[PDB]
Subunit: 284 residues, 7 copies
């Protein structure tokens, strides 16, 4: 892009020959098991008109993939995290504004084709099967899709939701995955087994790593502030969320039918913060 | 290209050993939900005869993918954005001129072939089926095609229109996608379901990310101005648009037939701007 | 190549530790809708015996893809650009000479093979079907082929002609694409439709981007001049062309048969220019 | 990411123009055969508010893949390592905190498709076989999955567990791999052989290299400490583990049926360590 | 290679910290339409014992792809270039010697294996069909093969000959391509057409770009000379060739049979040159 | 990894702004035909607490692929090297310790999924053929697998053993490769031939290059030593091994049955060495 | 490797901040048509204990692919080069030793798995067809294999032998390629033709480029010498070889059967040389 306009590389960039102020803020949630890391770097480029503070939202959010409760030798349920979210918010009254953020929403690329279709040899003719022709396509489906919640001048949000999961190397089961005979098969182990329901749950290790241990954010954001602002201080609200579902399962005495509610429980490890732009330091 | 003429890399470039002026202008639309970011960098290279101001049109445009209205337990509609556009315009009287822009329109590459065709073994002969031979091809179709509206010395425009969308992992449905029995199936959930029409709409998360939250421009442009101009100031008109369609659906008591009008509503978050070339600053 | 002779990289290059003169010339065609950009960079390397001026032919040429005329509810035509050309010419009397140019004409790579052929099991024998064996191949066909018109010491020409186009994801139709029953199907929408012919044309957005808006040159050239020339000035003739065709269509009351003439109309946005080698500046 | 916000590369980084202190600590387990390497590098960047000590956990853990015992000409067993783990722990009372770690848990990418499905030619119709359509998919399964145990402010853990193994180039056998007739076939050599059971074990060289010799960690971690801490010293607990299983096998006089217990034995080469932050040295 | 011996990159190279002399020689053939470009760069490295002059043979050779003559409404011919050659020669008496040249002759890589062959189920047995097994292979065939004519201390030659060409996307026709019924089909348009033979020739644009306009050399060579030579001057003979064939065609009143002679005509734009090693300049 | 923690590249590295001592030790085995090369480089980084001497084990080990003996017109054998090994050892009493080594043992990656399996159309149902489903898989098998012998604080060992070999482009024969009718076919030429057995051996050139000439180590190791050690000297034991097998073959008057013993003969070109850490030199 | 031990790149290398002596030696064989180029670069690194002279064996060896003799209208032969070899030798008495060489012998990588095999549906059972299962495999076979002759402290040799060749795009014929009916088909043109045998030979241009013109070595070697040697001079013996075969062919009056002898003739362009290590110059 930059070099495509024949501009020398790095000419239209920022963060050079200046004294920046980085930092390190670490916080842990003893109850929800959520790790927090908001590594920052203040930018005060002279050529750049406004101030900057690139916010790197590191850390991790645990999974808590465990059997929360059992209700008999044939009935039991499991709670698993379904959507880790980070909706950072900035108070309206503050003049500070979000101006750039990564990741973002990118186009999804398909690859469609057509193999063979003709009216044979021995054989007005506007059959409806004209769409019933070669339809070869291809694309990929990551199990967790890092979406970007539609931001604004105040709130920048992300949502890493559950797309689908493969079980027993058979069927890309998703958040609904309903089979009338067997119910849902998201984390099943035996279809017609007679084992204990609490113990008849798919092993967390042989599944996606995100569910078992957790997920680690690596998202980034920059907030821009007027250089001539009287008060060089704002409020950063960091919010780590989790959406546990209720993947219940019961034995119909013939096969195991399971039902999963949507967003049964939520967690919110919100945390206030203060930015000392004058000191170019994010106070803990 | 440059090195292919044996020129040393970077010799025929601009933006070196000079003092450039960058900046930051952020604006948000409280009603249309449109974000605006026009990050700029003034260029005043001595070897280069004219002035420059590379305009980087960042920001985002929301999607507003929601059920706008319902008209009964069997009839309802949805409004979804179809074409985000950025048609920046510059007044005619101003001597400032656009000279380069990215992205542009690139050639589309196919890959055609032929598998097998012959007159068997046991078998003048100019059958019409000579085109009915091996026709294997391959290419890709992004769901949103970032077109470049044919620019001029004043107006440089872009249009990120909707190419197609895949639903239920079955059929690359597009802006027309008409099936006489079922109507349009762009965002359907159940074909023969009996659920509420307002609630019988495909979930925004399991679709393209652009529709749900929105789309973020990353387009760039440069306007060149005479170095000996008496008045070192022009007018930049930044325009963010959206084209919501009207994807209604109704139950024929047998199956759900939906119709989508074209360009039912539009939005235009136009914004005047002033460039202080003398100050090498884009005033807010 | 250079390093293959064990020469240090960049040793046999030009454009280093010297003062070059770049520039910017912008011009627009109010009638033909053609943009012009001849970004230049003068080279006066001391080690290099001759002078240089690398000419970068940027800009764009509009498409003007519109329904030029209609001749009844069943007969109508469309004019679409078929070959954008840039034939720069330099007057013969001038000693200035072209010496290098990019792009050029490159070899086309096929990939041929053979799957299976044998005289079975139960089965002198020099059948003509010895060529009727495994014939698997593969290669790519870009829709617009940037050819290099055979240059000389005076004229360097390019021609970006139309190779083929895919319609309805069915058939790589080309500049002739004749089917006796249906005529030409380059930009058809309905084969047996009853809609208005002027409105029965394939949408420009769902086709190649070049036809709808236009095409943007990025070609480059260098002209070399004697360093001891008495008159340090020549004449650059920049020429942007377009070849609109006449893709008419008519309804045979059974199906739509269309005919496309070849090179029905042309445009030539020729422009004289003057090079001030003494000033190392391209005067507008 | 960094350059996507147009920041100059390396601007938002640490570890520059400062005097760091590296080191080398080597320790070996004469009994368990575990190698230990905790290569370290102290960081005291002035711009960075806190202290750092990036911990590189090199070394190796042997496999001890040998026939531990035999119980007759037809019955014998083998002990093989199933899960190498490194759960470094830091005492709670110490203010030192973990802030970043690599590797982490990444999304798993599938690639799903659909080949062909239609209601033929000669042939309401809501068959249950609508999911019985083209389901072409592909992905990769590494035999050892480097998982990241859900960390916290004190404990950062890893677990390189056994995913699956291919035997005789036939069947991706895993940790359960139960066939009722033949039992488990993880490390079998002959299915209906009459050879000695202790000698009827798959050769360690023609299997995964990890089991035979061992596995070498290359994991990394950084602990951050308050710069104004009164006591500049903490306690690093490095722990190398192993989980030997009991892959026994017996001859049923017709075929060899083997059973593998889960986590029969474990090893823990825990090692206390002391960090002299004042000296910027990790004492052995 | 160099770094594989642990040598620092660039240590065993030439052309550093020295004053080289480049240049520019341009010449055009007003009759044969051949462009000549012998861009040069003198090398006088002190560490290197001998002198150098790396010769870069740029320029182009036209195609002259036109209907040379017609001999009736059914008989006509076409002349097309078949082998562009550059055989640079240096006089024997001169002590100057060629020492390195690019391109060179490289190995051709195949990729072969077997799919399936077995003696079925129901079925000494040394059938001759043991070679009639899986023969899947793959490789590529460029249409023009840049061969390196076997050089010597005096003559360094190249030959870019015609390998094959694809017509009508059907059959990789080559320099012989004989079919008894239809003759040769190298540049045919209609097999059983009744159109004028002079006009019944494949369009040059829809074929390889080399034939229509021409081909551009980019070959390189270096000649090494004794540093203590009394006479610091030699003679460079640059030779650009072309081999037009005679692709005639005639109508047998049933189908068009064409014959192509081999090397019917040739062209030789030889050019003497003088090297002033003392001046480190290639005089025109 | 390093940059993933946002550390500047090269910050956590060693071997900079210091004076290192390299060297060159060459030795050849006149009898076993083993070449020895232990290229070294002493490291004395001030920031690094300990000393270093990176040991690069270059050289080669011959193959000696020849017909060692013949025992009649129908019986003969061949000796071929099966496992080149380099087990460097360091005496226990010496405080010097191995701390890092490359290559190491890496995970093996498969690629598995399913094509198609269903219960047809016209057709409780827990058939054992549920594993008999789409089992498409693929991976690579190098013929010589560079394993890493499980090291310790004293001995670091490698073993490049024979995985498999392809003969006659038919069958990936391995170290056992037993066919009851034909015996082993590792290096056979004719299955039912009548030629001399000593001459009926597969040509060494049309096989793997390692067997014919030999194999060249490129392995590396580093030993770390206490900086405050009283005696700055240890003993490096370099050992190059070879494991010739006995691939005999005999004619059963119908077909050639061959047998290959395991590890029939071995060679050990052990060599003592002395490191003068004080001189920073490896004495020959 | 180097950076894998966390060593800074280039730390354990040679050839830096020192004055090296390159050179240029050119020689041509007027009879055998062999070019000779032994480009050299002396290395005298102070840190490195020994001396160095990296030998780059450039040049070329002609092919002489011509019809050597004809013996009747039906019988004729062709001589073609089969194995270009470079066996450089150094006299035993000289202390100079070879220590590193490129290219070397590398492992060959296959890619094998199974597609489908099962005992059907309607169908102890240890059939011999258990090896008759999915055997999909793939790998590459270059036509000329650059082998490394097993070197020693004195002689370093290479051998670029003929692997196979494809004729008529049908069959990868090799050095034996015997078919009883047609004989050898290495360079045949017509199988049942009646043309002159001397003229019935495959055209050299439509075959591998190596045979027609020749092959160009690019091999490299380094010889190391004691720095304290009394006599700083040795003897380099450069040897370029060729192995012409005798590919005769005769007409059996039904088909053309050809026989090719092995190594019928050889050539040896040996050349003595002298190294002046004191002068750091390779005298011609």
């Amino acid at each position: 892009a930059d070099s495509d306009i024949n501009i020398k590389t790095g000419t239209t960039d920022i963060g050079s020959n200046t004294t920046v102020k980085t930092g390190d803020l670490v916080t842990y949630d003893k109850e929800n098991g959520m790790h927090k890391k908001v590594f920052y770097s203040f930018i005060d480029d002279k050529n750049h008109n406004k101030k900057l503070l690139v916010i790197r939202t590191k850390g991790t959010i645990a999974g808590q993939y465990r059997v929360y409760s059992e209700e008999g030798a044939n009935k039991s349920g499991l709670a698993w995290p379904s959507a880790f979210k980070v909706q950072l918010q900035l108070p309206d009254n503050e003049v500070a504004q979000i101006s750039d953020y990564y990741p973002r929403n990118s186009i999804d690329t398909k690859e469609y084709m057509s193999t063979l279709t003709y009216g044979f040899n021995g054989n007005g003719g506007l059959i409806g099967a004209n769409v019933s022709i070669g339809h070869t396509l291809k694309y990929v489906q990551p199990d967790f899709k890092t979406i970007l919640e539609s931001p604004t001048d105040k709130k920048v949000g992300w949502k890493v939701i559950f797309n689908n999961m493969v079980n027993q190397n058979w069927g890309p089961y998703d958040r609904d995955s309903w089979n009338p005979v067997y119910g849902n098969q998201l984390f099943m182990k035996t279809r017609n087994g007679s084992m204990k329901a609490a113990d008849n749950f798919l092993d967390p290790n042989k599944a996606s790593s995100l569910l078992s241990s957790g997920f680690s954010p690596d998202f980034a954001t920059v907030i821009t502030m007027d250089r001539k602002a009287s008060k060089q201080q704002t409020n950063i609200d960091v919010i780590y969320e989790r959406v546990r579902d209720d993947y219940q399962l019961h034995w119909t005495s013939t096969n195991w039918k399971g039902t999963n509610t949507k967003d049964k429980w939520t967690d919110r490890s919100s945390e206030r913060y203060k930015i000392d732009w004058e000191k170019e330091e994010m106070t803990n």
